[PDB]
Design an enzyme around this catalytic site. Structure first.
Site, PDB file in Angstrom:
ATOM      1  N   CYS A 285      78.983  90.387  42.174  1.00  0.00           N
ATOM      2  CA  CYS A 285      77.859  89.578  41.752  1.00  0.00           C
ATOM      3  C   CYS A 285      77.989  88.217  42.416  1.00  0.00           C
ATOM      4  CB  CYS A 285      77.747  89.468  40.207  1.00  0.00           C
ATOM      5  SG  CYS A 285      77.318  91.053  39.439  1.00  0.00           S
TER       6      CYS A 285
ATOM      7  N   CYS B  62      81.800  89.652  37.263  1.00  0.00           N
ATOM      8  CA  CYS B  62      81.524  90.653  38.261  1.00  0.00           C
ATOM      9  C   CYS B  62      81.725  89.981  39.631  1.00  0.00           C
ATOM     10  CB  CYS B  62      80.039  90.995  37.966  1.00  0.00           C
ATOM     11  SG  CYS B  62      79.166  91.968  39.206  1.00  0.00           S
TER      12      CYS B  62
END
Ligand code: CU
Length: 108
Positions: A35, A32
Site C-alpha cells: 500500500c 500494508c
C-alpha cells in the site's frame, strides 16, 4: 498528495458514486507495505491524468463499511468507477507504467 482525494464511508456516495467522470479508488490500509509502495505512483498518475481522472484513497481501517460492499478481498485493490458503477479492477501493487496501461485501456 495535493492531487489526491481522501474519502470516508460518508463521502463515498457523493465523491465517487455521484461523481462525474472517471474515478480511480485506492482501497488501502495502514500496515500494508505494498500500500505504501504505490502511494508515490498514485501521486504521479494523478498529476498526469488531471481533467480526465480523479484519484482517491480509502483507508479501510478507518472506513470499514465500504470495502465489503465491493467484495474487497485484499489490499491494495484499485477500483475504476464510472457513472456509479465499477468499470474495472486490479488486485495488488503494480508499476507506474502498469497503472498507465490499465487506465488507458479503460479511459474513453
Ligand atoms: Cu501532492
Amino acid at each position: 498528495s495535493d492531487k489526491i482525494i481522501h474519502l470516508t464511508d460518508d463521502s463515498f456516495d457523493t465523491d465517487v458514486l455521484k461523481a462525474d467522470g472517471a474515478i480511480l479508488v485506492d482501497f488501502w490500509a495502514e500496515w500494508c507495505v505494498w500500500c505504501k509502495m504505490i502511494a508515490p505512483i498514485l501521486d504521479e498518475i494523478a498529476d498526469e491524468y488531471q481533467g480526465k481522472l480523479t484519484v482517491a484513497k480509502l483507508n479501510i481501517d478507518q472506513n470499514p463499511g465500504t470495502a465489503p460492499k465491493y467484495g474487497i478481498r485484499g489490499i491494495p485493490t484499485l477500483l475504476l468507477f464510472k457513472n456509479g458503477e465499477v468499470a474495472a479492477t486490479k488486485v495488488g501493487a503494480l508499476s507506474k507504467g502498469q497503472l498507465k496501461e490499465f487506465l488507458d485501456a479503460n479511459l474513453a
